[PDB]
Amino acid sequence: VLQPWSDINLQSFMTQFLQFYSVVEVWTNLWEHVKKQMAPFLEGKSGESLPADCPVRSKLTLGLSILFMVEAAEFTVPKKDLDSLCYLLIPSAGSPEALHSDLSPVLRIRQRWRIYLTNLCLRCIDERCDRWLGILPLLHTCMQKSPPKKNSKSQPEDTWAGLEGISFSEFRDKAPTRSQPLQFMQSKMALLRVDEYLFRSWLSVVPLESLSSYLENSIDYLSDVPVRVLDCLQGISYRLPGLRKISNQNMKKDVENVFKMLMHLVDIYQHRIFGENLLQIYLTECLTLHETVCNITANHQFFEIPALSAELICKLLELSPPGEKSYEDLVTSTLQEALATTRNWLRSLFKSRMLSISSAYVRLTYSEEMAVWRRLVEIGFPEKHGWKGSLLGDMEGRLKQEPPRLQISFFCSSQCRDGGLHDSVSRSFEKCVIEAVSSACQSQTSVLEGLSCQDLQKFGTLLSAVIT
Amino acid sequence: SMAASRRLMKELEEIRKSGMKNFRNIQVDEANLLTWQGLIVPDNPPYDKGAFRIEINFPAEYPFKPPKITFKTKIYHPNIDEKGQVCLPVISAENWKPATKTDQVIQSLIALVNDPQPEHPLRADLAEEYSKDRKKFSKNAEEFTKKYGEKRP
Amino acid sequence: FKPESQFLDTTRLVQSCVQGAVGMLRDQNESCARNMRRVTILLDLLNEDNTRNASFLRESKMRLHVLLNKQEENQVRSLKEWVTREAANQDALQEAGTFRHTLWKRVQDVVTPILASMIAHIDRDGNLELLAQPDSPAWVQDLWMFIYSDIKFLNISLVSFILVQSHMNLLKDAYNAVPFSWRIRDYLEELWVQAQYITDTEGLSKKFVEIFQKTPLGVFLAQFPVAQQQKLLQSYLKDFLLLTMKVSSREELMFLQMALWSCLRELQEASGTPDETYKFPLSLPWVHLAFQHFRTRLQNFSRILTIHPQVLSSLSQAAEKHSLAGCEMTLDAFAAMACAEMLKGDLLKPSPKAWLQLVKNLSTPLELVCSEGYLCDSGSMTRSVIQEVRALWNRIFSIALFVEHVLLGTESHIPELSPLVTTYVSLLDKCLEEDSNLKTCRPF
Amino acid sequence: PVNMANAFLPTMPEDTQTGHVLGSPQSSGVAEVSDRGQSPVVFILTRLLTHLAMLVGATHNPQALTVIIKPWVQDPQGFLQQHIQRDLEQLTKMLGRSADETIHVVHLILSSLLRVQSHGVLNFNAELSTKGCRNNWEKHFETLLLRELKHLDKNLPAINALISQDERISSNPVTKIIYGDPATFLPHLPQKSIIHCSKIWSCRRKITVEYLQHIVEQKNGKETVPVLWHFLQKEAELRLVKFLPEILALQRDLVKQFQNVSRVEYSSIRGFIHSHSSDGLRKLLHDRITIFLSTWNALRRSLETNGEIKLPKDYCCSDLDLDAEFEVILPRRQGLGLCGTALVSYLISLHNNMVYTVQKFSNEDNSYSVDISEVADLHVISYEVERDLNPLILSNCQYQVQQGGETSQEFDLEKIQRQISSRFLQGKPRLTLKGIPTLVYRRDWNYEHLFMDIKNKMAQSSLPNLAISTISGQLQSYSDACEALSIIEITLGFLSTAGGDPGMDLNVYIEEVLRMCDQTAQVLKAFSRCQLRHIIALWQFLSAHKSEQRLRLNKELFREIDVQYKEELSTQHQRLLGTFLNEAGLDAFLLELHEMIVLKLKGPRAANSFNPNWSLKDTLVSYMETKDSDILSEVESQFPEEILMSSCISVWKIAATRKWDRQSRGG
């Protein structure tokens, strides 16, 4: 009766099945009967190759029919039947969206089938989860288009992915013993042309360690449309604040890899990504990403991730083509906010003094500190704004907190090496050194007695300071 | 806003008690003071044979936004179109000031009616007619006033 | 406002900003401006003494926190550092005096418009009066708290002088007897729409009541005593009357109240004995069902009350003389009967043209009520009642035709035949009593 | 046609709108109802003759008609041929006769308007340059068309017989069995029968609503049956009235869910319809928006002509679809949201006009009136023409026969009038605009409406001198002044939208009536001796006080106003202001000045009319007549005229500093 595929035939099918179930061990025999209908499609048959006695020709139609049957029965299904059923809902050979919109009038009514698909997804929550990912295309072909709003303004990640009924938090945060999603990704990669929500709903579910791979093997996809980088950033800044403090090397390298591929994918194509006055949303998104990534590092050794975030903001500002004064106000505001966020982060995570001696062999309490200061100032920002009159001032103020004599002793204690060929932090160090020498020589206490200070350039600077 | 309409009420009272002897039969609806209707009665020829009905609408931003004056009676002027719109420099947005009371506007527009200005016309052809042959303009305006002009009070 | 700090005294802050919040609300210049009543109501139930007040404080703080968190993500995070922004604000720092007074003032300014919008979305038509009312049964407070703790059920949005609209154009201190009227009305409209579209018109009532029992509101309401649900029932019925139908009267309010109750009772008796949906006969959605089954026979009835208010006075005794609203609806028929009696009573007044007008304004409702298909199914006694009502309506309709033709003509053209036509109309009226069916031979 | 550049063309709707603005012929809109004062048949005849006129003009020179007709730029030939096809279709649908006979009748009209040589068309512009001459020419055209149309039925059989006698189509066998000749010449025919006669098997016309319009306008129905004429004049638009309740429910739901300003992020209508959590609501709203868009498309042709609310033409130019923008359906009153509001306004206006005319014709009195807050399904006129109107109108077409033998069609207007009146049109009350759903957009922060509300509710009076002295001495600090300003502004907002007692001084009001707890006791001591009946005055004083305090120290006193008003005064103007301050009520003057400045000099878009070249006297006397009634002559006759409004906060600075010198250096 289900043939041909129409709303009237679907309604008659549902009524007839309801009457059949009302009138008529029974469902065991029914399932054993439906398995013989299932098998030919699993053997790859479709269309003419299907058995002549098969009452259903299309496969999504029989998938919907069996979904209706299992919904009106409230029973369980064997695990081997999950792969067989989920193979039947993938819209294979349905790459254009025109055929999806042509099949939509046969499936007009919207939310009851949403309910059945949700309970199918929750019923396939079992530990097979192999052919599940093909249902989201149908779960989004009858859903709203991509909302152009900002992160965390509209609503949480559930509606951005378009699911709103599946909790993927436990899968992204567990022991990854099932690597099947990656191979399925490289198997059915050409699906995402059918609709747009699939990129978001798929970035939501991919684990952290495989997100870099999922990112750089979509180079052709991002060349087809230079606007899904927005959604990649949306996903990253959605999942980032939820993840807590990173204290490990696995997450360290995973985030390094994904950020590195992010810079690659942003850089290679063109400035054309930032067309149609889309720079504002990109700036807001990169600011939120920087804010989220800065608040999850409190180990003084994961500075490189904020470094790449700062470099991302740098390159995003650099590729902006000149145009009104609104853009200049926007860029001043975003630079000020970035510097404020970095300043607050370095205020928060570094709770201790500096170069406490404690051993007559004075050494830094936060030894991996100078590299952090160098790395998070070397990025390029416009000189009309701060980032040079503010963070260098932070260096000056931090170094004016230490006693002149102890700081001078540490200044060439075989730690502050590697003169960076007019490094700005090196110039700040020389300035605070000459001020400390001036203060020490202003008092009547001897300053140089035991310097094991074989580096000669800073001996020269010290001598020039003491004479002058 | 009614804050404005209070000042228009004061203006109407003072103009009615003072009298103008040339702008008669003023009427207004009390539920909406922002629309005045009046009858221009000129004194100088060739416009001494009829009177002309006018309507002045006051924007809610009055006294500050200048009122807009339209002519409800067809009149043969080089300065007023068939739509009735009239350009008065004392009311133009770039020359408006709040102290300009409605009686000064009425006096200025009546004086302009009695003595047209061709250098800034709204009907170019009538300006050319006045400039190149005064007699033709005289007969045309007199005939227009005769055929379409309202009955004098 | 995050639950489990002592970094601020939130109750003190809300008592300080309630006045400023309520000061910015604007009614429509005559719609029972109750600003002083609102602020007093809030400040006598924003305390920590009673258990209901403590739970209300917790729920209101939760609402304030969620609204503030939703509105904070719009900021550029330079406003998230409120302390730093306000400190760098020399103007307000030297305006409010000491630095902590300045910080408290900035918190007051930030919070007051959100609280104003919250009060606008809470006191839609006097919903605070129910919490203010003493000795109110437990159901009022319980549904108020259930609605107040459900952000998804009641979305409160924020916008500057904000306007509050009167849904019912309520009279002087009407204070609709259900906590949130428009909210449940719209939610039940949506639920009925979903039921009516999911299934066809064969099992609509069962699916509607089942899907109302599926919502958390239904399962929460199911635990109340039967008497409390009954009180809820007539309160909901009267406020539904007020919201859907405007009425310039209080007696007619109770009259259509009884009419809709009798319609609900008749709809309950439409099914023989399903004994599954009959387990919940005293429920809210039934009222909606009644409307969507009997809308015509309600609205037409309202017409009879609006065109000719005088009939109401007659009806004020008719309910006493016949005990209407027992099993089904006959109240529009009673209004028609009393109206017909008064029409034959006054008859040719000093202005018989006015009599023509007051019979012809009301012809169409009595034509519509006396129609087939108008009553899908009812008892045999109502069949006899409707038979005699069409009989009398056709009788007085022929009388009205006779009047509006001959009495109009003689008074308009030749005033010399009135004493004869006034007796001949009486003769034809008295000769048609026994046979109220003109299709037969003898009446013609 | 070159001489007809932007000339007043006839047979066009008037709201001037010169030109040839007409929609695409392939539209589902109105039936092109007649204009204000012309019969529709004469209107259509004149319109088709004029259409042929510009068709000939365009074929002579296409560019002239391209520059005359506004919308299209491609070609006039197809557009005009589609107009002519639609005109002939409407002609053959309206006239009750064969299409060949309708072409015969139009040819007869064209030939009959040729022998009317008697000239009485005088006093009209040949260039159609004035509306009066256009109406005059239309009046002559109506007169001649009536004179020609009143004598056409006596020539149709004769012309048919003469044309059928043409001895070149007479050889064609078709015209014998078609154009009025017996078909008995065919040998393959049944024998002569009393039922198979030629006239019994003859064609007859069909009854249609347009033919009803024709019959009621040709019989002078204005004085006998005007109700039917008014009903069929706008029957096309009232055919959409049945959809009023659900679209009103749409406006109600949109207002209820989105009582917000500048908070909607939805861009497409499809997104809204498809972003709802209920499928029943989803498909309901789908059907409802489909009906809304169909009614909008069918009715976007008379709103810009007779609708009470003026609208730009940028909304009725593009057809609405499921993927259209979002703001069209929002019931707003400013722009692009006025579509549905104006549509429902026109629907209510036509309903009210019809019920009013019907009452003024027959009822003469009715008290049955209702708002839009209880609109039901049957309350509005709801009928289907194919099932309701057609049978009720066709039931009253009597046939009359004579002894000689003839079949005449006659209409009893009383019968059909009583039929249609006693079914739908009677029992409809007078709808009022009180309860129309509408989103609120603007704000009342400007603080003047608050002051006039205070003056309406309460009889405001001046502040006591002792009270003002005590509050001035009590509020000498700046923080106290700011707290007093905040509290008094809160109470001002409270009093603007609520009542109060003119007595009941502010202290007891604050302490318990709104139950505002104690912040500082000093402001309470200040409020101890001020009444509510001076509250607005108190505000202004205290406001000025605050800014005066900002003048006393070295802090910037505005920090918000535009830089175009922040400049110093000239030397001569300083001397003039000093000589003014020499003798004047400086306290009141500075109070009024600060009341002015802080309200409207707010920075950007403060120069909409406030051009910085005016004088203080002019603007002060322009303001002072609004709500205040303070001392007058001291600024009318003494204040200098050459003050250069641009630098007017400088005048306030000078006045405040001189007042400081008065108060402090004096004592």
Numbering used by the authors:
A (entry chain A): 512 to 535, 557 to 855, 863 to 1007
B (entry chain B): 0 to 152
C (entry chain A): 3426 to 3429, 3472 to 3626, 3637 to 3921
D (entry chain A): 4418 to 4432, 4499 to 5150
Question: Mind quoting what the paper says about this structure?
Answer:
As prior data (RING domain independence and activity with UBE2L328) suggested RNF213 could be a transthiolating E3 (i.e. covalently receives Ub from E2~Ub onto an active site cysteine), we used an activity-based probe (ABP) based on an E2~Ub conjugate, specific for this class of E3 mechanism. The probe structurally mimics E2~Ub but is chemically modified to undergo irreversible covalent labeling of an E3’s active site cysteine during transthiolation. Based on previous biochemical and proteomics data, we used the E2 UBE2L3 to generate the ABP and appended a biotin tag to enable detection (biotin-ABP). The 3.5 Å structure, revealed that UBE2L3 is bound via a well-defined interface formed between the C-terminal domain (CTD) of RNF213 and the L1/L2 loops and H1 helix of UBE2L3. CTD residues Phe5093, Trp5097, and Tyr5106 are oriented to undergo hydrophobic interactions with Phe63 and Pro97 located on the UBE2L3 L1 and L2 loops, respectively. This contact is putatively strengthened by nearby electrostatic interactions formed between CTD Glu5108 and Arg6 in the UBE2L3 H1 helix, and CTD Asp5101 and Lys96 in the UBE2L3 L2 loop. As nucleotides were absent from sites AAA3 and AAA4 in our RNF213-E2-Ub structure, we postulated that RNF213 might have reverted to an inactive conformation during sample processing, rendering our structure a covalently linked “footprint” of the activated transthiolation intermediate. To explore this possibility, we generated a second cryo-EM structure where the ATPγS-stimulated ABP labeling reaction was applied directly to cryo-EM grids. Modest structural changes were evident (RMSD = 2.66 Å) in the AAA core and new density at the AAA3 and AAA4 sites allowed modeling of ADP. However, there remained no clear density for the RZ domain nor Ub and no apparent basis for activation of transthiolation.
